[PDB]
């Protein structure tokens, strides 16, 4: 079926030390029920590469795919920004 534009989550890479898999760190910031301020808490989405195409420190977005391995689900769609030491 074609009904989902899959949940696209931008983020950055944290490590590349496993075959065809990376650990994208999605970033967002969420509120607090008691007060009304905002604070950011991170996550670490593992991701399925084809040939370890993504690099360390890269900026990339991902999408829902399917359960692919033991606690890794999302696939990459497009590398956003790739660079060297800044």
């Amino acid at each position: 079926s074609e009904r989902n534009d899959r949940k696209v989550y931008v983020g950055k890479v944290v490590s590349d030390k496993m075959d065809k898999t990376i650990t994208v760190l999605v970033e967002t910031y969420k509120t607090h029920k008691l007060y009304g301020k905002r604070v950011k808490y991170s996550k670490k989405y593992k991701t399925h590469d084809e040939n370890n195409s993504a690099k360390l420190g890269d900026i990339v977005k991902i999408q829902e795919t399917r359960p692919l391995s033991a606690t890794k689900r999302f696939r990459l769609v497009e590398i956003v920004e790739e660079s060297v030491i800044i």
Binding site: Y35, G36, K37, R38
Partner: protein, 131 residues
């Protein structure tokens, strides 16, 4: 390092109330000019006069006082301050002192008094009450 310019202007205004001096000096800003204009339009400010020198400001304003030298407001403070920013919808927008006072609020189309902001059904981030 100054965390907030609105806090500075409101402290200057209140500290001008406590000793009563017609003239005050404060580095200007676009939001500062707009809120000063709305202050004059409510009736609390006798006159407004911007000046230019290196680089910003410095906004000089002329206060207002009653014939018996009575301060118009009985209090003045902000709501949206750093760390805890605040926002306000169109219907939820508060009526401080009802008609008596007004509620400066910054909107997607510009900063206006509390009234027009509830009339147009467009809210925004409040800045400071005044009453």
């Amino acid at each position: 390092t100054m965390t907030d310019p609105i806090a500075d202007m409101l402290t200057r205004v209140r500290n001008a109330n406590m000793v009563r001096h017609e003239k005050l000096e404060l580095p200007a800003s676009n939001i500062k000019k707009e809120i000063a204009e709305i202050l004059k339009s409510e009736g609390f400010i006798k006159n407004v006069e911007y000046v230019e020198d290196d680089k910003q400001g410095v906004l000089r304003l002329f206060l207002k006082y009653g014939q018996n030298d009575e301060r118009v407001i009985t209090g003045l403070k902000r709501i949206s301050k750093p760390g805890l920013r605040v926002y306000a919808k169109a219907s939820e927008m508060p009526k401080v002192l009802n008609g008596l006072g007004i509620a400066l609020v910054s909107t997607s189309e510009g900063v206006i008094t509390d009234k027009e902001a509830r009339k147009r059904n467009v809210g925004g981030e409040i800045i400071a009450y005044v009453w």
